Amino acid sequence: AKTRSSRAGLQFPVGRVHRLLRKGNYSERVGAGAPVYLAAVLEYLTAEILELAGNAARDNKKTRIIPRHLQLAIRNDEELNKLLGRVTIAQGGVLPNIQAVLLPKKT
């Protein structure tokens, strides 16, 4: 008896996902590929963010990822940003950005 995840080469719970699908009133019937595909995409997107967040944590000389790190990862990355366009990260802050005309004259 083995996990559908390990059968698909994944970390995310193929089984959990399949159940959430059935139980979420998206459709009457749910193909056996669906949760395998969906779980994998969720894993890919989680991983992408965790690479970046992680880097922005290393950058801060901090061993643990915190919301700021997530925010910096996401906001600094054209695509992640779009995807999370109307999303508000709690305790994330904003990217350092002072409009040009508000600085004094540089030399």
């Binding site: 994998a40 992680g54 990822i65 305790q91």
Partner: protein, 99 residues
């Protein structure tokens, strides 16, 4: 001892597992993990919803991996979409042949 707290599910372990695959020596705060949990739940509902509508727009009773895919193409930006479509496809192709 009194009553033990009722089960609340989470993606936390699966986020951790992933985390260690990417940045082994990197860990993660309670609040951070809560954000990851929102994010996964978010994109579930997004993709599931789009797939629901795809199926229903085509008079289909079934959300198959086809629905999940087209959905992902509709919902993800370029480079993110591709890699998604790969890793999903990979992982079905593996699942299929491991029966």
């Amino acid at each position: 001892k009194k009553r033990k707290r009722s089960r609340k599910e989470s993606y936390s372990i699966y986020v951790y597992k992933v985390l260690k695959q990417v940045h082994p020596d990197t860990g993660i705060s309670s609040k951070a993990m809560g954000i990851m949990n929102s994010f996964v739940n978010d994109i579930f509902e997004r993709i599931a919803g789009e797939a629901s509508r795809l199926a229903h727009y085509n008079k289909r009773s079934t959300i198959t991996s086809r629905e999940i895919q087209t959905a992902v193409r509709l919902l993800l930006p370029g480079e993110l979409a591709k890699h998604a479509v790969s890793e999903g496809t990979k992982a079905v192709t593996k699942y299929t042949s491991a029966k």
